[PDB]
Amino acid sequence: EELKKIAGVRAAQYVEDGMIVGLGTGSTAYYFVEEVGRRVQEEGLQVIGVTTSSRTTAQAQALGIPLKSIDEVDSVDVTVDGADEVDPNFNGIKGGGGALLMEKIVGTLTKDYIWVVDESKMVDTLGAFRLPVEVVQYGAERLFREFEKKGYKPSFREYDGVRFVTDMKNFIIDLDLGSIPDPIAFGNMLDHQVGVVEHGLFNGMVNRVIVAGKDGVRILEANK
Amino acid sequence: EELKKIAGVRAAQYVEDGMIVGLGTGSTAYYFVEEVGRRVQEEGLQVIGVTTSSRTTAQAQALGIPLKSIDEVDSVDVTVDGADEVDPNFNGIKGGGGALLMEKIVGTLTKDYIWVVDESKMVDTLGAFRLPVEVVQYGAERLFREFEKKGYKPSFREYDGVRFVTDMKNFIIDLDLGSIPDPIAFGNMLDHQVGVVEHGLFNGMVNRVIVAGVRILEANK
């Protein structure tokens, strides 16, 4: 939690006057958003934020960070967001907090895409963290059954017994896959599944990973 | 028109007592739904319908066909739906009426999936009809621009000036591709596009196409 804050704050250093800046979601990106808001008020930093979720929108508006829709910009200069897992090939799993779909839409349109994480998110192979898959409401139960038949071990995302509904009005089914030896293939295969909106594998996307740990902060370059 | 009704009734002959039946839309498929409703009213037929559109839900409720969602049954035995285009390899363009997402969800779950159309929907190559592409609201305009830059001639689906919101709360962008000589590759490419929920290429799905004729064409499948 203190490590999550050092990572989110450090990332705010990559933001400059005149940037369009993607604003991530989740307990680590939250510190980055806070810090961007702090620089906008103390320094007069001139940015325009583009959101990745309704929670982030509310947080940015409270902080006074000016906002525009992804629709209203042609590209995003820098986006900082968290990750549930990051492998050594700079593929990740995202969506633990429910906002994978808008996070992938903004990440795809980002020139310098940065993840912030604590040391515990660096894994040798993706998959111990259940893969979030955003799914159409209509026919989701039939889809869940198909995923059970395939051995993906699904569960609906729910909080306090309430089935989770995303910002774009879908559900999430998490897949207990254990290990994803070829996340490119597996993402591309999930892309052909009718009833799947988006999934949480972010492959070949991130440019820089900022890792805060007990020993200090490491800045890991993907070098595409 | 008389032939379309004969074709829609002929497709209802695949429906038997005790089936779960998908109920679609289309200039010819409308007659198939009327005929199921008549067999329920007049011949004691016992079925459960699963519709692809809220216009068919109203139609079926007027006729007293009992309905359920796709989530409340195990398998759909027979689905009859329309199509905007069907090619000689039994791929098709659907979604001209806006219902592509529920049509594809119901189609995927169907054991005997039938399209019933008239001759003008049979084409040599798909593409003269605009391809519907159902898209996530957030970033839809930027995606429109990307499709424009790729030469796909997009237009947002709108009615009376109002951008169309699909049943699952997305927009549609129709692409004027002209000709889609490899619909499998094109659908694959859309399926990878971040921001696309679904698209109107139904490839390798349909079992049988019934054409006003009346002719019954069997797909490989």
Swiss-Prot record, chain B:
Could you name the active-site residues?
Answer: 103 (proton acceptor)
| Enzyme class per UniProt | isomerase
> Mind listing the GO molecular function terms for this protein?
ribose-5-phosphate isomerase activity
Catalytic activities = aldehydo-D-ribose 5-phosphate = D-ribulose 5-phosphate
Asked if the keyword Protein biosynthesis belongs to this entry, the reply reads no
Q: Which residues of this UniProt protein bind substrate?
A: 25-28, 81-84, 94-97, 121
The pathway is: Carbohydrate degradation; pentose phosphate pathway; D-ribose 5-phosphate from D-ribulose 5-phosphate (non-oxidative stage): step 1/1
Which keywords does UniProt give here?
Isomerase
**Annotated GO biological process:** pentose-phosphate shunt, non-oxidative branch
UniProt-listed Enzyme Commission number(s): 5.3.1.6
Family annotation (InterPro entries): NagB/RpiA_transferase-like, Ribose-5P_isomerase, Ribose5P_isomerase_typA_subgr, Ribose5P_isomerase_type_A
Q: Which family does it belong to?
A: Belongs to the ribose 5-phosphate isomerase family.
**HAMAP family according to UniProt:** Rib_5P_isom_A
Biological role: Catalyzes the reversible conversion of ribose-5-phosphate to ribulose 5-phosphate.
Summarize subunit and interaction data from the UniProt record for this chain: Homodimer.
Indicate what this protein is called per its UniProt record. Answer: Ribose-5-phosphate isomerase A
What organism does the record attribute this protein to? Streptococcus mutans serotype c (strain ATCC 700610 / UA159)
